[PDB]
Design a protein around this ligand. Structure first.
Ligand SMILES: Cc1cc(=O)oc2cc(OP(=O)(O)O)ccc12
Length: 159
């Protein structure tokens, strides 16, 4: 894996919008989105968020992430973390999370990164734990079927 990163571009939209493979995956990375996902929904998120970034390997966009909260001198909150289906488990999310941690430190002077993860997303909970994130709180949310889910709110000091 030879990964690089750059800001997301218009031309990447269609690729990235192809990443969520089912309603659960879309919900875990973008819970306000409606299935089926679309470029317009992704672009609307990008326009109201900050730091939309892609990860690239062998000429392919393999990952995407941004911030949905940012508070200068304080923290950022990571969201829209998506990985191409052929590139799962290969370190793309770990890579991009490290890039986003640097961006939060450098641009926003953040002392903390927040990641919230829905309870069903075991792979996410385990990854964030490996990367040094700690659970802090659990909040109730509702999924598109009106069923109660638990949002596990995690954080990590930055340096
Ligand atoms: C997990 C997740 C990803 C994302 O991109 O946005 C989120 C936005 C969220 O907003 P509320 O706290 O429900 O207002 C919750 C979770 C996420």
């Amino acid at each position: 894996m030879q990964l690089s990163h750059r800001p997301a571009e218009t031309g990447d939209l269609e690729t990235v919008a192809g990443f969520p493979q089912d309603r659960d995956e879309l919900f875990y990375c973008y819970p306000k989105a409606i299935w089926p996902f679309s470029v317009a929904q992704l672009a609307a998120a990008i326009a109201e968020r900050r730091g939309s970034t892609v990860a690239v390997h062998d000429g392919q966009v393999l990952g995407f992430a941004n911030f949905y909260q940012w508070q200068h001198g304080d923290f950022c909150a990571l969201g829209n973390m998506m990985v191409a289906p052929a590139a799962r488990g290969l370190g793309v999310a770990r890579y991009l999370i490290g890039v986003m941690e640097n961006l939060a430190r450098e641009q926003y002077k953040a002392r903390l990164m927040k990641i919230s993860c829905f309870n069903a997303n075991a792979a996410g909970l385990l990854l964030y734990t490996q990367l040094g994130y700690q659970p802090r709180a659990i909040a109730e949310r509702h999924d598109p079927d009106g069923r109660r889910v638990a949002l596990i709110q995690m954080d990590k000091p930055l340096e």
